[PDB]
């Protein structure tokens, strides 16, 4: 409820790591399964 309880730098670090993970998965997927050319 209260604004400020969870520090913004943590929100940014976690969200950013989430983005890195998902994008990373997409790049893994470039080498495996469909579109991998194999």
């Amino acid at each position: 409820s209260e604004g400020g309880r969870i520090p913004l730098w943590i929100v940014a670090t976690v969200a950013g790591m989430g983005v890195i993970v998902i994008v990373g998965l997409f790049f893994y997927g470039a080498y495996a399964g469909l579109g991998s050319s194999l």
Binding site: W9, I10, M17
Partner: peptide, 29 residues
């Protein structure tokens, strides 16, 4: 594959952990 993602999980978390611990303890950031 599970082992590699576990390793990069601990190593990956180490830094933000350093920062978090220092921020919690009012460290010299």
């Amino acid at each position: 594959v599970i082992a590699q993602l576990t390793m990069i999980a601990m190593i990956g978390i180490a830094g933000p952990m350093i920062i978090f611990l220092l921020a919690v303890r009012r460290g010299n950031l």
